[PDB]
Amino acid sequence: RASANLAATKMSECVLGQSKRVDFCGKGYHLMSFPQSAPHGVVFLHVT
Amino acid sequence: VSMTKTSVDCTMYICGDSTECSNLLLQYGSFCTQLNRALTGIAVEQDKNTQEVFAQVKQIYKTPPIKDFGGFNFSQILPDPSKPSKRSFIEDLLFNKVTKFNGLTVLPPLLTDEMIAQYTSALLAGTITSGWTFGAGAALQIPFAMQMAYRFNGIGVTQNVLYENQKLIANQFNSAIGKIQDSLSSTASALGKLQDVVNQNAQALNTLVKQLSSNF
Amino acid sequence: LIANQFNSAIGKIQDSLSSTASALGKLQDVVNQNAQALNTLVKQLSSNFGAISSVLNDILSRLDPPEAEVQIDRLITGRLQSLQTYVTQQLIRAAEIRASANLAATKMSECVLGQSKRVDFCGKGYHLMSFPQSAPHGVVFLHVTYVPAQEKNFTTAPAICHDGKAHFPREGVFVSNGTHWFVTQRNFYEPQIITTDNTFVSGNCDVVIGIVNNTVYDPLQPELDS
Amino acid sequence: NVFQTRAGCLIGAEHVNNSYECDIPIGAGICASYQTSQSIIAYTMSLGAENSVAYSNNSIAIPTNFTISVTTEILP
Ligand SMILES: *[C@@H]1O[C@H](CO)[C@@H](O[C@@H]2O[C@H](CO)[C@@H](O[C@@H]3O[C@H](CO[C@H]4O[C@H](CO)[C@@H](O)[C@H](O)[C@@H]4O)[C@@H](O)[C@H](O)[C@@H]3O)[C@H](O)[C@H]2NC(C)=O)[C@H](O)[C@H]1NC(C)=O
Ligand SMILES: *[C@@H]1O[C@H](CO)[C@@H](O[C@@H]2O[C@H](CO)[C@@H](O[C@@H]3O[C@H](CO)[C@@H](O)[C@H](O)[C@@H]3O)[C@H](O)[C@H]2NC(C)=O)[C@H](O)[C@H]1NC(C)=O
Ligand SMILES: *[C@@H]1O[C@H](CO)[C@@H](O[C@@H]2O[C@H](CO)[C@@H](O[C@@H]3O[C@H](CO)[C@@H](O)[C@H](O)[C@@H]3O)[C@H](O)[C@H]2NC(C)=O)[C@H](O)[C@H]1NC(C)=O
Ligand SMILES: *[C@@H]1O[C@H](CO)[C@@H](O[C@@H]2O[C@H](CO)[C@@H](O)[C@H](O)[C@H]2NC(C)=O)[C@H](O)[C@H]1NC(C)=O
Ligand SMILES: *[C@@H]1O[C@H](CO)[C@@H](O[C@@H]2O[C@H](CO)[C@@H](O)[C@H](O)[C@H]2NC(C)=O)[C@H](O)[C@H]1NC(C)=O
Ligand SMILES: *[C@@H]1O[C@H](CO)[C@@H](O[C@@H]2O[C@H](CO)[C@@H](O)[C@H](O)[C@H]2NC(C)=O)[C@H](O)[C@H]1NC(C)=O
Ligand SMILES: *[C@@H]1O[C@H](CO)[C@@H](O[C@@H]2O[C@H](CO)[C@@H](O)[C@H](O)[C@H]2NC(C)=O)[C@H](O)[C@H]1NC(C)=O
């Protein structure tokens, strides 16, 4: 559940917007992220 | 995000098909009614976990038939109509990596895998065509080439850097995505965080089954 | 207009709460789970666990000690295991509440005491402010957010050639209502005449993709001519 | 009145071609609800309104008006 809550946080603040949080959305200055599904999980592609 | 929605029954596990054993078990009060409640509570929130992550868009957006995104190439992450389950190319790579009679059953997830892919397409389709505007209110379209100019401002780089370097930036993005496909297609350990969850639940369940062979 | 919309938005909260009981489900479930867990513990006293009776005094009142000692041991083992089950359930459940309590403390700091740029952390929309309200065993936040409402289709351009040089907006985008070019903000259509004070120059016409032709009005020219 | 689903055999529910939001979850994408003489129905649940965006490389939609909304977030 803690991971599921973390995944929901990233979806909101990384896909739907743009983060100023350091290293929260990939190492570098964050531009955008794209979600991808996986078996029992989620995969984020972070563009920095 | 979630794990297997298992369900276990006492009356077939402790006293599987025996009248004498079943009558004795009733002398222990409501242990199984308490246990079957605990496992149900887990199973229900496993659907909540998926619901919170993916069901964040109320409308299913979809990209236009013309893919003129200023030079950027998303064909490796947008849906693939050639599959019966409309999953992208990279998603297909991810699914190809991650892999009884004693009252032990597995319940099916409420969101089927086809529905999960449909949510990620809407989240992805919104991002390219509307920026961050679809998150707050209604999706307001904006050219992708311009969308990056205001993503660059967000990190303190003046937007003229993007436009004067638009072909260079687009080519670097396309190659960066291509490397992801090469990474996944060869390195199995990339998905270890999800394989361990599957392995832990199967390993825990097999221990439960083996316990029936003990004399105690 | 803004003040009247705020006052009506607050009024709707009262109408929502006064009729929909399910609004407080997240707090009612916590109360129900603890009462339900505690009642199970009490019911366990009625079980025999293998002894001849669920009542402890009836064993003592009917058996002399060398026999009662075995019958009592069955009740102690069963009742002691019942407490361990209850306590374990509370330790896991208490950890779940703490995570919510830590989340509630985070929102209080970053939503009431300040203003968040985190998306959907403080309500859906562009966050303005939040107001805390207490509740039984919980906290209720009223999140005030800005949501864009009505939109128009404008033609746009990334830059403008005037004298061979590319002009870019300082803040906002270039838009056209079909015939004229203006510079305007992001989240509120407010056209402005393109001047030397709205834009900055970089390079020339030949490198940016999609540049258009217009004139950037220079406010200084009429002041020196007159 | 027997409807075969991927989660098991559902008896007593009237299978419907339409798609709605989930009311009582069953599994595998099937939900049931009590609505129109009235009876329990089963259907494939829907994810939301289908809505394409009018994308083009020289077209922007800019809001001209706004609304102030207040939402309620409840935490234990
Ligand atoms: C941006 O959106 C706003 C609403 O989201 C717009 O404000 C609305 O503007 C219209 C037209 O000017 C008003 O409608 C008229 O209102 C008058 C008087 O209103 C009184 O009665 C209403 C109804 O009880 C009440 O809500 C008001 O507070 C007044 O007491 C009526 O006589 C007319 O028949 C007609 O209904 C709306 O009332 C007004 N809404 C609000 C909340 O103020 C605004 O015009 C939009 N701006 C732009 C540039 O488009
Ligand atoms: C796009 O915006 C421009 C800028 O406002 C519009 O041009 C303006 O159009 C109005 C309406 O025809 C003109 O108003 C007229 O002004 C004259 C005085 O010049 C007055 O005597 C008339 O009674 C009328 O009010 C306005 O002058 C004109 N501005 C300029 C600088 O020419 C244009 O019409 C808009 N186009 C669309 C499709 O909305
Ligand atoms: C914005 O305005 C500028 C200038 O008004 C336009 O540039 C002009 O483009 C035309 C044709 O593209 C040029 O004509 C060419 O002239 C050369 C000689 O210089 C001649 O050999 C060719 O056969 C042709 O006639 C014109 O010279 C050029 N003017 C300048 C000052 O560079 C520009 O095209 C406009 N923007 C758009 C998008 O049309
Ligand atoms: C985006 O990348 C894909 C992946 O390479 C491109 O698809 C290739 O297209 C060329 C010509 O159309 C073919 O020769 C390749 O075989 C394709 N590769 C694959 C894996 O299908 C696609 O063309 C790119 N986007 C654009 C607009 O060119
Ligand atoms: C925006 O995209 C459109 C896509 O049609 C571009 O229009 C085409 O542009 C090419 C060359 O750039 C021409 O050969 C075609 O004839 C155009 N098609 C039509 C229907 O006019 C348009 O150029 C793009 N915008 C910019 C600024 O390049
Ligand atoms: C609603 O769904 C039912 C199936 O659940 C459809 O009935 C089928 O119709 C096809 C014709 O395309 C037949 O080949 C099948 O044999 C029918 N099913 C059965 C069980 O006989 C029905 O046509 C659908 N109606 C609408 C309006 O969508
Ligand atoms: C902006 O323009 C687009 C296309 O010119 C509009 O989208 C069309 O809207 C009509 C009805 O409003 C639909 O019948 C079309 O199918 C839409 N086309 C596409 C490609 O989606 C859009 O509504 C306009 N925006 C506003 C705010 O009016």
Side-chain angles (χ1 to χ4, degrees):
Chain A
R1 187 175 66 248
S3 182
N5 286 343
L6 176 60
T9 298
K10 288 186 192 300
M11 189 74 74
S12 293
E13 301 178 42
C14 204
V15 186
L16 265 56
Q18 180 194 17
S19 284
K20 317 296 197 303
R21 299 175 62 178
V22 182
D23 291 331
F24 182 58
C25 276
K27 301 151 201 266
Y29 300 98
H30 181 249
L31 295 175
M32 64 186 78
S33 297
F34 307 119
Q36 301 283 267
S37 66
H40 294 332
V42 67
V43 177
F44 290 96
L45 306 180
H46 299 301
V47 183
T48 63
Chain B
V1 166
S2 49
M3 64 175 195
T4 290
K5 292 168 66 175
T6 188
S7 176
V8 179
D9 180 10
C10 284
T11 299
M12 184 102 25
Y13 178 83
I14 300 175
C15 291
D17 181 19
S18 171
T19 299
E20 295 82 6
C21 187
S22 180
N23 287 342
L24 291 170
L25 182 59
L26 291 174
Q27 293 180 342
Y28 288 83
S30 80
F31 266 125
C32 304
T33 308
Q34 169 183 23
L35 302 174
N36 293 46
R37 185 183 297 114
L39 289 171
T40 297
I42 292 169
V44 171
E45 76 180 48
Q46 296 313 301
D47 289 306
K48 182 180 281 180
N49 290 342
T50 299
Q51 191 71 5
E52 287 186 346
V53 175
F54 294 102
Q56 277 182 355
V57 288
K58 64 182 181 293
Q59 317 197 328
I60 308 305
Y61 311 85
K62 50 174 56 179
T63 48
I66 61 169
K67 312 292 182 284
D68 170 56
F69 291 143
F72 297 70
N73 196 22
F74 298 110
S75 75
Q76 313 302 107
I77 52 176
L78 286 179
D80 205 351
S82 300
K83 204 163 181 309
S85 176
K86 293 176 63 71
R87 299 199 288 234
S88 74
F89 185 95
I90 287 171
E91 284 170 301
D92 280 340
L93 296 177
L94 298 171
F95 276 84
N96 296 345
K97 294 177 200 306
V98 179
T99 72
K100 193 57 58 69
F101 271 125
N102 307 307
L104 297 173
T105 68
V106 175
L107 303 171
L110 159 64
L111 273 185
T112 179
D113 290 296
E114 304 79 323
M115 284 174 184
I116 300 300
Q118 216 177 33
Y119 271 130
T120 59
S121 178
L123 290 164
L124 177 56
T127 300
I128 296 89
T129 64
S130 61
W132 55 61
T133 66
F134 85 97
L140 314 169
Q141 78 263 16
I142 182 180
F144 193 77
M146 292 179 50
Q147 177 177 311
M148 287 294 248
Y150 307 97
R151 299 263 179 181
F152 267 62
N153 282 340
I155 62 166
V157 179
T158 309
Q159 66 188 293
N160 65 353
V161 170
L162 170 69
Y163 296 120
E164 292 167 352
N165 295 271
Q166 184 173 336
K167 287 181 180 179
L168 174 61
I169 292 164
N171 286 337
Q172 289 178 348
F173 172 75
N174 294 340
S175 294
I177 294 297
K179 290 179 182 345
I180 297 300
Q181 293 178 167
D182 214 38
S183 177
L184 291 173
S185 295
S186 64
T187 313
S189 66
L191 274 286
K193 287 183 65 53
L194 274 68
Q195 186 67 11
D196 299 353
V197 171
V198 172
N199 287 344
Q200 287 183 38
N201 289 295
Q203 172 178 112
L205 191 62
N206 281 45
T207 300
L208 183 63
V209 172
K210 287 284 289 180
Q211 286 298 56
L212 291 170
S213 73
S214 296
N215 313 332
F216 293 116
Chain C
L1 174 62
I2 292 164
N4 286 337
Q5 289 178 348
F6 172 75
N7 294 340
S8 294
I10 294 297
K12 290 179 183 345
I13 297 300
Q14 293 177 347
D15 214 38
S16 177
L17 291 173
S18 295
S19 64
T20 313
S22 66
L24 274 286
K26 287 183 65 53
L27 274 68
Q28 186 67 11
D29 299 353
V30 171
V31 172
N32 287 344
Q33 287 183 38
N34 289 295
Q36 172 178 112
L38 191 62
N39 281 45
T40 300
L41 183 63
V42 172
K43 287 284 289 180
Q44 286 298 56
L45 291 170
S46 73
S47 296
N48 313 332
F49 293 116
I52 71 177
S53 311
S54 65
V55 191
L56 186 60
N57 286 346
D58 282 13
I59 295 167
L60 292 168
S61 178
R62 294 177 22 208
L63 276 298
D64 62 357
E67 292 81 1
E69 303 294 307
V70 62
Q71 297 300 312
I72 291 168
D73 180 339
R74 290 179 224 188
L75 292 178
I76 289 170
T77 298
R79 290 176 175 181
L80 182 57
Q81 178 179 5
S82 181
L83 282 168
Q84 289 173 348
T85 299
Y86 171 79
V87 171
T88 298
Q89 297 297 307
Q90 290 295 101
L91 288 168
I92 294 167
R93 188 176 297 111
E96 181 177 358
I97 294 297
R98 187 175 66 248
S100 182
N102 286 343
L103 176 60
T106 298
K107 288 186 192 300
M108 189 74 74
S109 293
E110 301 178 41
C111 204
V112 186
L113 265 56
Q115 180 194 17
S116 284
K117 317 296 197 303
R118 299 175 62 178
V119 182
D120 291 331
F121 182 58
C122 276
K124 301 150 201 266
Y126 300 98
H127 181 249
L128 295 175
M129 64 186 78
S130 297
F131 307 119
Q133 301 283 267
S134 66
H137 294 332
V139 67
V140 177
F141 291 96
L142 306 180
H143 299 301
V144 183
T145 63
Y146 174 98
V147 179
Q150 301 180 25
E151 57 263 32
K152 293 181 182 179
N153 283 349
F154 296 101
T155 297
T156 188
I160 280 182
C161 286
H162 173 50
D163 197 76
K165 315 179 290 288
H167 293 65
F168 301 87
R170 280 213 179 91
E171 315 170 70
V173 297
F174 287 131
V175 298
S176 168
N177 70 344
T179 67
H180 293 68
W181 286 93
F182 304 102
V183 57
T184 192
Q185 314 173 13
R186 274 296 204 157
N187 309 107
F188 200 81
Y189 178 60
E190 187 172 66
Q192 296 273 107
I193 299 186
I194 315 164
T195 68
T196 301
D197 293 345
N198 304 336
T199 67
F200 66 92
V201 176
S202 159
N204 59 76
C205 288
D206 294 323
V207 60
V208 59
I209 295 173
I211 193 155
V212 305
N213 275 25
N214 202 265
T215 66
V216 289
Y217 170 61
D218 194 324
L220 186 63
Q221 180 66 35
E223 294 297 322
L224 271 50
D225 202 86
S226 172
Chain D
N1 219 350
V2 178
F3 179 29
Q4 180 74 63
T5 111
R6 185 179 296 113
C9 184
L10 178 64
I11 296 171
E14 190 182 5
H15 176 52
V16 178
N17 301 58
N18 295 323
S19 46
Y20 307 70
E21 77 287 13
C22 194
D23 198 8
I24 300 169
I26 293 173
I30 303 300
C31 296
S33 69
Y34 188 68
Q35 65 182 177
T36 55
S37 57
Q38 293 208 118
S39 68
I40 295 168
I41 62 169
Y43 50 85
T44 300
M45 70 181 190
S46 179
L47 307 186
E50 151 69 28
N51 161 25
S52 61
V53 185
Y55 178 92
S56 190
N57 48 333
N58 61 359
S59 179
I60 188 166
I62 299 169
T64 63
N65 204 350
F66 60 86
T67 72
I68 305 302
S69 65
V70 178
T71 67
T72 300
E73 185 170 17
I74 299 166
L75 300 170

